[PDB]
Design a protein around this nucleic acid. Structure first.
Ligand SMILES: [Zn+2]
Ligand SMILES: [Zn+2]
Length: 67
DNA sequence: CACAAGTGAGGGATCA
DNA sequence: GTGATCCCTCACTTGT
């Protein structure tokens, strides 16, 4: 099973389908300090661990890897 | 501005 | 549709 966007093959349609969901680029998780939007909750909780290290943290919006 | 190295966000996996 | 986790990537970032 492959995708018409990347051509990346997937051994199961269950995880190919969650890959096509990554194409719409839904960023529903936002940091309540620097306003940066995230695709996963785990990406947000890992991000605050660095907000405790440094005081002045503000990254630029990074690009998603697949369109 | 190339270049290396350190950085952290994106995205793949199994599973409840 | 979640999401949690383990982890490897790779674009930014920094320094030379
Ligand atoms: Zn795809
Ligand atoms: Zn933040």
């Amino acid at each position: 099973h492959f995708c018409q966007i990347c051509g990346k093959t997937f051994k199961a349609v269950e995880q190919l389908r969650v890959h096509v969901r990554r194409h719409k680029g839904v960023r529903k998780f936002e940091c309540t300090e620097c306003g940066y939007k995230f695709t996963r909750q785990a990406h947000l909780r890992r991000h605050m661990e660095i907000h405790d290290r440094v005081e002045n943290y503000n990254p630029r919006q990074r690009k998603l890897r697949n369109l």
